[PDB]
Write an enzyme that holds these catalytic residues in place. Sequence first.
Site, PDB file in Angstrom:
ATOM      1  CE  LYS B  38      -3.940   2.137   2.615  1.00 45.86           C
ATOM      2  NZ  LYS B  38      -4.900   2.057   3.783  1.00 45.86           N
ATOM      3  CD  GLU B  87      -2.410 -12.500   6.081  1.00 43.86           C
ATOM      4  OE1 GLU B  87      -3.040 -13.555   5.844  1.00 43.86           O
ATOM      5  OE2 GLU B  87      -2.421 -11.947   7.230  1.00 43.86           O
ATOM      6  CG  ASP B 132     -14.826   1.357   9.082  1.00 44.62           C
ATOM      7  OD1 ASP B 132     -16.077   1.470   8.963  1.00 44.62           O
ATOM      8  OD2 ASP B 132     -14.023   1.778   8.203  1.00 44.62           O
ATOM      9  CG  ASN B 137     -13.245  -1.718   6.193  1.00 44.01           C
ATOM     10  OD1 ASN B 137     -13.228  -1.396   5.002  1.00 44.01           O
ATOM     11  ND2 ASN B 137     -13.372  -0.826   7.178  1.00 44.01           N
ATOM     12  CG  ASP B 150      -9.617  -0.187   6.336  1.00 43.23           C
ATOM     13  OD1 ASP B 150      -9.103   0.644   7.132  1.00 43.23           O
ATOM     14  OD2 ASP B 150      -9.838   0.092   5.144  1.00 43.23           O
TER      15      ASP B 150
HETATM   16  C1  LIG Z   1      -4.347  -5.546   1.355  1.00 37.42           C
HETATM   17  C2  LIG Z   1      -4.743  -6.745   0.599  1.00 37.42           C
HETATM   18  C3  LIG Z   1      -5.602  -6.923  -0.463  1.00 37.42           C
HETATM   19  C4  LIG Z   1      -5.589  -8.314  -0.746  1.00 37.42           C
HETATM   20  N1  LIG Z   1      -6.328  -8.922  -1.727  1.00 37.42           N
HETATM   21  C5  LIG Z   1      -7.182  -8.354  -2.714  1.00 37.42           C
HETATM   22  C6  LIG Z   1      -7.650  -9.233  -3.676  1.00 37.42           C
HETATM   23  C7  LIG Z   1      -8.472  -8.709  -4.648  1.00 37.42           C
HETATM   24  N2  LIG Z   1      -8.954  -9.543  -5.653  1.00 37.42           N
HETATM   25  C8  LIG Z   1      -9.956  -8.979  -6.555  1.00 37.42           C
HETATM   26  C9  LIG Z   1     -11.040 -10.010  -6.845  1.00 37.42           C
HETATM   27  N3  LIG Z   1     -10.545 -11.357  -7.173  1.00 37.42           N
HETATM   28  C10 LIG Z   1     -11.600 -12.283  -6.834  1.00 37.42           C
HETATM   29  C11 LIG Z   1      -9.360 -11.834  -6.475  1.00 37.42           C
HETATM   30  C12 LIG Z   1      -8.825 -10.951  -5.370  1.00 37.42           C
HETATM   31  N4  LIG Z   1      -8.789  -7.406  -4.662  1.00 37.42           N
HETATM   32  C13 LIG Z   1      -8.327  -6.624  -3.702  1.00 37.42           C
HETATM   33  S1  LIG Z   1      -8.785  -4.903  -3.805  1.00 37.42           S
HETATM   34  C14 LIG Z   1      -8.535  -4.409  -2.129  1.00 37.42           C
HETATM   35  C15 LIG Z   1      -7.365  -3.775  -1.778  1.00 37.42           C
HETATM   36  C16 LIG Z   1      -7.149  -3.415  -0.472  1.00 37.42           C
HETATM   37  C17 LIG Z   1      -8.113  -3.677   0.471  1.00 37.42           C
HETATM   38  N5  LIG Z   1      -7.947  -3.332   1.820  1.00 37.42           N
HETATM   39  C18 LIG Z   1      -6.921  -2.570   2.348  1.00 37.42           C
HETATM   40  O1  LIG Z   1      -6.029  -1.925   1.767  1.00 37.42           O
HETATM   41  C19 LIG Z   1      -7.001  -2.597   3.822  1.00 37.42           C
HETATM   42  C20 LIG Z   1      -5.724  -2.383   4.573  1.00 37.42           C
HETATM   43  C21 LIG Z   1      -6.777  -1.311   4.564  1.00 37.42           C
HETATM   44  C22 LIG Z   1      -9.297  -4.290   0.119  1.00 37.42           C
HETATM   45  C23 LIG Z   1      -9.505  -4.657  -1.186  1.00 37.42           C
HETATM   46  N6  LIG Z   1      -7.525  -7.049  -2.729  1.00 37.42           N
HETATM   47  N7  LIG Z   1      -4.759  -8.946   0.103  1.00 37.42           N
HETATM   48  N8  LIG Z   1      -4.253  -7.987   0.898  1.00 37.42           N
END
Ligand SMILES: Cc1cc(Nc2cc(N3CCN(C)CC3)nc(Sc3ccc(NC(=O)C4CC4)cc3)n2)[nH]n1
Lengths: 33, 265
Positions: B38, B87, B132, B137, B150
């Site tokens: 991030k 992670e 939250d 999240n 989150d």
């Molecule tokens: C941080 C993080 C994110 C993941 N995985 C994913 C995976 C993902 N994918 C999109 C959909 N297909 C089905 C596969 C997985 N899309 C997002 S889009 C997304 C990005 C970030 C967050 N959340 C955060 O940044 C949290 C920490 C505050 C939620 C969704 N994040 N593993 N670790």
Amino acid sequence: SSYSYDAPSDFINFSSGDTQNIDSWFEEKANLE
Amino acid sequence: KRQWALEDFEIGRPLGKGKFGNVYLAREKQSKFILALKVLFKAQLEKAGVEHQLRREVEIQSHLRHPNILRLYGYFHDATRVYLILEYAPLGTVYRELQKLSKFDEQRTATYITELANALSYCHSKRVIHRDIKPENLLLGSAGELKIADFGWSVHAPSSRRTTLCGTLDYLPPEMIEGRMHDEKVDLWSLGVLCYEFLVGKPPFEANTYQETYKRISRVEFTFPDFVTEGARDLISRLLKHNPSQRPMLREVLEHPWITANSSK
Ligand SMILES: Cc1cc(Nc2cc(N3CCN(C)CC3)nc(Sc3ccc(NC(=O)C4CC4)cc3)n2)[nH]n1
């Protein structure tokens, strides 16, 4: 600013479930007098 | 000791569109270990006034060690950016799963609720209130296990109760709406809101205007669709108590007969 956090910024060897002590940080921060 | 440097990572695609455009698939160069990385820009943080919030979020989440809580392995920064090394959860957000599926069967919802209660239980043993809890999240790992992702509104409340109105409209506890102080029981409220959205596909206090949603949350005005089973109603009703003091303990949720009858081995 202080982007200097009470948090891990040391390189980790990812290539090798218990580092148990770490969360002790909470009660210690609560235990601050 | 050796500190992280950007040069330690190979950066791939953004993990997400929109508000998540910010978080990349990443690889530690030596181990080949896949991460989410991030990226935040300092100047925009400091102009917004949110840099102390960040400090708190990193400090909290980087000290939490649980199966159902997304590791923040570490952070570092340079002249312009702060990096969070998180992670990677390959199955994406619970929210996406809800979008895809519309609503969850009872087994999946109870499993999500079990997993989640376990995470907040552990959180509360640390005097941390999340503040939250909501489908975005929440992330899913390899085995489809729930992870709390989150910690942007989470606080370490070791002694003193909190005044900060925070969270997401449809999930705000009544004590926040009314401008009273709040404690860890807010997470129990949002848990009930979540268990409801899981089974029905929309949260219980949804309105056209926020004014009207506030009011329904305070009066606890909500109803269940006919398909919601009695044990699911009981649980949700127990969690959704105006008086936070009346809300169950998380061990009680974990031992609720609908939860036990419906969650997995
Ligand atoms: C941080 C993080 C994110 C993941 N995985 C994913 C995976 C993902 N994918 C999109 C959909 N297909 C089905 C596969 C997985 N899309 C997002 S889009 C997304 C990005 C970030 C967050 N959340 C955060 O940044 C949290 C920490 C505050 C939620 C969704 N994040 N593993 N670790």
